[PDB]
Curated annotation (Swiss-Prot), chains B, F, G:
<comment type="function">
    <text>Produces ATP from ADP in the presence of a proton gradient across the membrane. The V-type alpha chain is a catalytic subunit.</text>
</comment>
<comment type="similarity">
    <text>Belongs to the ATPase alpha/beta chains family.</text>
</comment>
<protein>
    <recommendedName>
        <fullName>V-type ATP synthase alpha chain</fullName>
    </recommendedName>
</protein>
Curated annotation (Swiss-Prot), chain C:
<keyword id="KW-0813">Transport</keyword>
<dbReference type="GO" id="GO:0046933">
    <property type="term" value="F:proton-transporting ATP synthase activity, rotational mechanism"/>
</dbReference>
<dbReference type="InterPro" id="IPR022944">
    <property type="entry name" value="ATPase_V1-cplx_fsu_bac/arc"/>
</dbReference>
<dbReference type="InterPro" id="IPR036906">
    <property type="entry name" value="ATPase_V1_fsu_sf"/>
</dbReference>
<keyword id="KW-0066">ATP synthesis</keyword>
Curated annotation (Swiss-Prot), chain D:
<protein>
    <recommendedName>
        <fullName>V-type ATP synthase subunit D</fullName>
    </recommendedName>
</protein>
<keyword id="KW-0066">ATP synthesis</keyword>
<dbReference type="GO" id="GO:0046961">
    <property type="term" value="F:proton-transporting ATPase activity, rotational mechanism"/>
</dbReference>
<dbReference type="Pfam" id="PF01813">
    <property type="entry name" value="ATP-synt_D"/>
</dbReference>
<keyword id="KW-0375">Hydrogen ion transport</keyword>
UniProtKB/Swiss-Prot annotation, chain E:
<protein>
    <recommendedName>
        <fullName>V-type ATP synthase beta chain</fullName>
    </recommendedName>
</protein>
<comment type="similarity">
    <text>Belongs to the ATPase alpha/beta chains family.</text>
</comment>
<comment type="function">
    <text>Produces ATP from ADP in the presence of a proton gradient across the membrane. The V-type beta chain is a regulatory subunit.</text>
</comment>
Length: 310, 192, 104, 206, 155, 192, 192, 153
């Protein structure tokens, strides 16, 4: 919830990099809550009141004390309003569907009542189509200025990624941001694990004329470096630190500095320029020859800044 | 669902298809793409396509392919040992096998679908990359017997040439290939 | 057995019956030690610390193959007349031997 | 591993055995650490003795060439041959074989340590005792290094068990449980469906 | 399988369990009751002063701890041998065998609680006084010192 | 069933409750009561209650509580070495953390429910004891930097003063607290 | 089905039968027959048949059977450590237990249904083989206490006699057994 | 999956089974027949003196025992490490490797029972003559000793 509220607060579109140069417009927020507790609802209402967004938002609130079968209408009404606003009034809407796990639990309740053929853990065999009818109501239309973005939030049961709810969602959605219990226990906010996280539409939104040209390669190199660092960390937990080669020791230091300066940022709003600066600073910890995912030109342009960022 | 291959659809398909391109989430997490598990995949067409390869790619293409498969199998065998006892505990031959297996993974098996040149690869280019990798492996084995240190081999500059070979374009690749083949011998003569 | 150290002490070592040798440089010490170990023979080889603090680390390429030669860091002469920190040497040895690098 | 009740029970037994082995190896490492620190104290003593002997022997040698001619000392050293003064007997420590140098050290094998020099012979005695202390230091160091690498091996085994083997067994147990529960659920759904259809048939046509 | 529904539900409803062991049975011990996985949830409310004896609870706790140490040391000896053990580890090793032979293995005997407590104190006397942490010093003074010969003749 | 937190009831409950007080029989075996495990427990009310604390308890209460939590985490991070070797083999700083964890546990986290005064505690009293312990920690760390013997730091009567803070009545805690803070300030200056 | 002994039929049989001869797939895969899982088998008729065994086989047959059973349980106990650390890591007495368990498995419990002699065994032949093995175990334990290597114990040729006892015809067996009982004592006396 | 109903019921009905192994197939061994899970119920009916050769059954039993020991030592090396093996354990490792590469791997070649028994005896000669406990000493005298190099290389 904290991450969703922070994204809603800080979400901006940066026309200056794109090249249109026209003044931005703010996001309308449609917020659909299913089976939400009073604690979480209080958090969200207070955040929106604090940031003034409660005037440019629509709230559908199915609480955990409200009827269960009504939980199936909530996202559909929310998305009807979102599409109306976006594709008839040229708005840019941001939909937040909190606890889609509750939606799937309600769907299972109904399916079990009707004695339909189940799927994997009692969930109805059509759960995939039902979730698609909600998720595929996002996008952008040709000849229309408005848009609908969705950020569903679902709690993975028993942290299990192969559970039917996360599994089917990941087959429908365009990537996912997966939080790490380990990072959270280390005190990291926002605790976003990069390796199980993906965005499938990133390439159509970064590079020349959008952001700056080294974005994609920097991200690829960060992924490679962090994967190697995690592998070396697994090795160290068996065969001790002292046995590491110097290159592996470098990868370890990179993994730690990554987790402590890139992932951990608290409640700060970082522009894409500052994030890329921090990224190149972390990448400068490695020998310039081990950056195989980045072309020579970018390494020349940006390599060599220390972690002196303040 | 869940990546489980013991499900009715996958099992019913595997009884009828001639190839099984198995994707792996572990490889996709590390941004290794196309993310095909070469240990778990197979093809029942390799034997029948050998005559076509021997006249359209190279007369020895199947032997290079078999050698690369054997190197990968050896790497798979050694990885289980390494992950529990550390790379240093191995002998120099096995360490070279680990390093060449990594070179194969990163420089041959990986392919960038969003790159302007690496999206597509011809059979000649694949054969060239394999030939370069195997030539480097033979020279490196000779050097190990000659007492050369593994670190010296790994720090060579030709490795960068092999590592950037997939991003080179088709219209100029054979020249790059001849030059790199010369450079491999040149570099392993330098170590002596 | 045998020993490698400064020529000033090698004479005394030979006076006691050890095949002493004079080391003029750290590179000289390493080369002589490699020659001594490579040749099959004597079992103990104490090496002056000042010229080669970690004989096993330097000769790692051989001691890993053969286990009869017993290398040993022996104290320097001018140091001996002024003393040396044994406790620090043992702390480093513990770090090397169990890796956990802690003592008290 | 085929999903069966038998496989699940075997896998649970394997988990229990892995945990018991972790505890047993931890106790083994406890005993090894205790012995290791005893040997560290012993080695401190031996190294201090060696340092004192080095001081005294260097002193004696310095005065030997200072009164007896440095050429005299050099000649005395040249005359003395590299005698075979040790026997490299091996010793067994925690299942491993380590050298235990024994100083046979025939004194008569030293040729021409006495004669024209008046003190060079004494300096030979100091350096012979110094060699004895050096042998003792070697004996302690080999044992300490062996016990250290045994500790390292045990710790690697424990970490392997706690971070690769046990999690794998837990993952297998979870997977087999899921498969078995799913099969039971499917069978139950089938029975309910069939019985409902038979009841409907009886209602329609008895 | 203790996770089978029958024993799971029974444990849910009942107040402890007495677990038999096949290792003890195949070693010849009868009744083959293994103290380590056994528990009586209501024991503390039915033992002590005015019911049984004042030394009951601490004697039970000490027996449990000593027997567990003995079994662990028994596994450790197979690897590091008896010489590498300390004297106390050896005393625990002896106590565990004595416990199996004279405490668990009573055959078809009918032991009153006083006889069983006597045997328990005789076994605990093998351990050095002051290594019996879980027993107050008064009870140690009052009962410590018994000889194994009182039960040695009737395993 | 057997403490498996993956049971459906436990998982459904943990999706809806804002605090999880994890009891553990291991602590109760070690005679630590209440037997609440601070590593597995959590609460989702701290941030929303912080403004209340800053006015009803003290402005720095959140920071002191976070400091206590970090100290406990540091203690938990040193159990892989204290297990391998007793506390005596650790350096001065690590052993200081170990003893600070011990004092935290035994004099702030424990609470006798049958005691006449310890069975209850107010937020002012808890804040006072936390401030006591943290101030002692700062002074002890400074002293160790000044080369004081850690054993001397482990023999100061001020620690025994902190130990009895649990059993001082609410009407008498404030005087005890100011006096003991002043004694902490004056206990390390006296110690060379 | 599947070899799963948790099936309803096997479990319902398990609750009404007196003897349970569990078969092991692992032993059947190695062609070790009868291939009975000793750990998972039992009989409820032993105590009722002891008088018959005393009157008709040998007065101490029950004790010898129990000694064999205790040896097998000890081997099962040590096999866990063996799977943890390997067989060479064991101490001498434990390796002796492992070896005598193997001797029991291969020379007493193994039986060749298709052989002319070994297809059938009398109770007295079984008693003789058991007595041989137990006497060998006792003398080996005495030797190990006096400092005889296991390697030197396992090379004693009397083990070949013990291993070929199975094949001695019923008429010739008594003489063979007396010779072997003399030879065991001779062999462990000669070791000195 | 051998516990699937189809293979399970089949095996309960049929007189043995020849079970292939994916592990051998991936190593390139053809035919990839794994001998341990395979079985022939009626084999004893049609082997032995007057049918194939007097040593057949005992040689098959010895091969099974040796291969099982080899696979066990393979499971052991993952725990202890290769350098800790005994000479007999190393010999069984070598036997398992050679068995897989020469007895199982035969390609599309047609072997007579005589050649097959010769290869089996060549492989069994790699173990000490006293470790062959399933074969009678007459057959050990008559057939033990010949080297594999004589057959290939």
């Amino acid at each position: 919830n904290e991450i969703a509220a922070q994204i809603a607060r800080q979400a901006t579109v940066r026309p200056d990099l794109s090249g249109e140069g026209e003044k931005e417009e703010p996001f309308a927020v449609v917020f659909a809550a299913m089976g939400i507790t009073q604690r979480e609802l209080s958090y969200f209402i207070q955040e929106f009141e604090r940031t003034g967004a409660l005037s440019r938002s629509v709230l559908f609130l199915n609480k955990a004390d409200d009827p269960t079968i009504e939980r199936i209408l909530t996202p559909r009404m929310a998305l009807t309003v979102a599409e109306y606003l976006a594709f008839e009034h040229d708005y840019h809407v941001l939909v937040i569907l909190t606890d889609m796990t509750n939606y799937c639990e309600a769907l299972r309740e109904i399916g079990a009542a009707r004695e339909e053929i189940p799927g994997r853990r009692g969930y109805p065999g059509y759960m995939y189509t039902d979730l698609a009818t909600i998720y595929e109501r996002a996008g952008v239309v040709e000849g229309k200025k408005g848009s609908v973005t969705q950020i569903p939030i679902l709690s993975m049961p028993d942290d299990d990624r192969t559970h039917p709810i996360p599994d089917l969602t990941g087959y429908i959605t365009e990537g996912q941001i997966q939080l790490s219990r380990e990072l959270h226990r280390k005190g990291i906010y926002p605790p976003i694990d990069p390796l199980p996280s993906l965005s499938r539409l990133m390439n159509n939104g970064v590079g020349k004329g959008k952001t700056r040209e080294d974005h994609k390669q920097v991200s690829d190199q960060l992924y490679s470096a962090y994967a190697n660092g995690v592998d070396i960390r697994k090795l160290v937990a068996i065969i001790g630190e002292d046995a590491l080669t110097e290159n592996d020791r470098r990868y370890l230091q990179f993994a730690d500095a990554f987790e402590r300066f890139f992932i951990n940022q608290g409640q700060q709003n970082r522009s894409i320029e500052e994030s890329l600066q921090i990224a190149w600073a972390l990448l400068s910890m490695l020998p310039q020859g081990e950056l195989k995912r980045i072309s020579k030109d970018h390494i020349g342009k940006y390599y060599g800044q220390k972690l002196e960022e303040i | 669902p869940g990546g489980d291959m013991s499900e009715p659809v996958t099992q019913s398909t595997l009884r009828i298809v001639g190839a099984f391109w198995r994707l792996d989430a572990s490889l996709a997490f590390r941004r290794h793409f196309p993310a095909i598990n070469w240990n778990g995949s197979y093809s029942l067409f390799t034997s029948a396509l050998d005559p076509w390869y021997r006249e359209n790619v190279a007369e020895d293409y199947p032997e290079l392919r078999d050698a690369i498969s054997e190197l990968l199998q050896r790497e798979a065998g050694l990885q289980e040992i390494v992950q529990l006892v550390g790379p240093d505990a191995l002998q120099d031959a096995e360490r070279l096998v680990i390093e060449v297996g990594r070179i194969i993974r990163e420089d041959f098996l990986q392919q960038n679908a969003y790159h302007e040149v690496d999206a597509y690869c011809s059979m000649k280019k694949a054969y060239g990359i394999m030939k370069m990798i195997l030539a480097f492996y033979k020279e490196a084995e000779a050097a190990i017997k000659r007492g050369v240190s593994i670190d010296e081999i790994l720090q060579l500059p030709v490795l960068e040439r092999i590592g950037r070979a997939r991003y080179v374009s088709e219209e100029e690749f054979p020249a790059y290939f001849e030059e790199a083949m010369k450079e491999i011998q040149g570099a392993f003569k330098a170590l002596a | 057995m045998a020993v490698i150290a400064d020529p000033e002490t090698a004479q005394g070592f030979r006076l006691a019956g050890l095949e002493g040798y004079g080391a003029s440089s750290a590179e000289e010490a390493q080369s002589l030690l490699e020659t001594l170990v490579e040749r099959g023979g004597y079992a103990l080889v104490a090496v002056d610390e000042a010229l080669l603090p970690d004989p096993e680390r330097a000769v790692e390429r051989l001691m890993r193959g053969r286990d009869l030669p017993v290398l040993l860091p022996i104290a320097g002469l001018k140091e001996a007349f002024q003393g040396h920190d044994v406790e620090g040497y043992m702390r480093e040895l513990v770090r090397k031997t169990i890796g956990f690098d802690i003592k008290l | 591993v085929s999903p069966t009740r038998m496989n699940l029970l075997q896998r649970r037994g394997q988990l229990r055995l892995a945990q018991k082995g972790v505890d047993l190896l931890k106790k083994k490492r406890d005993a090894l650490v205790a012995e290791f620190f005893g040997l560290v104290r012993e080695a401190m003593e031996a190294r201090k003795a060696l340092d004192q002997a080095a001081k005294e022997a260097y002193a004696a040698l310095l005065l030997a060439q200072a009164f007896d001619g440095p050429e005299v000392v050099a000649g005395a050293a040249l005359g003395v041959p590299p005698l075979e003064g040790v026997e490299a007997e091996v010793e067994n420590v925690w299942g491993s074989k380590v050298p235990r140098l024994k100083a046979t050290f025939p004194d008569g094998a030293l040729l021409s340590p006495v004669g024209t020099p008046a003190y060079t012979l004494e300096a030979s005695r100091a350096f012979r005792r110094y060699a004895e202390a050096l042998i003792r230091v070697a004996n302690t160091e080999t044992r300490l290094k062996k016990i250290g690498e045994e500790i390292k091996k045990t710790t690697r085994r424990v970490n392997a068990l706690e971070q690769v083997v046990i999690p794998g067994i837990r993952a297998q147990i979870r997977f087999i449980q899921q498969v078995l529960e799913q099969r039971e659920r499917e069978d139950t759904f089938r029975l309910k469906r069939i019985k409902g259809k038979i009841e409907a048939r009886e209602a329609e046509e008895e | 399988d203790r996770t089978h529904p029958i024993p799971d539900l029974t444990g849910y409803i009942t107040e402890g369990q007495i677990q038999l062991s096949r290792e003890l049975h195949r070693k010849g011990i009868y009744p083959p009751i293994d103290p380590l996985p056994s528990l009586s949830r209501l024991m503390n409310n039915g033992v002590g002063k005015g019911k049984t004896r004042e030394d009951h609870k601490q004697v039970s706790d000490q027996l449990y701890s000593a027997y567990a140490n003995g079994v662990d040391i028994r596994k450790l000896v197979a690897i590091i041998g008896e010489d590498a053990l300390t004297e106390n580890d050896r005393r625990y090793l002896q106590f565990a065998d004595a416990f199996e032979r004279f405490f668990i293995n009573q055959g078809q005997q009918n032991r009153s609680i006083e006889e069983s407590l006597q045997i328990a104190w005789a076994l605990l006397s093998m351990l050095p006084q002051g290594e019996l942490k879980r027993i107050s010093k008064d009870h140690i003074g009052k009962y410590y010192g018994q000889k194994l010969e009182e039960i040695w003749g009737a395993p």
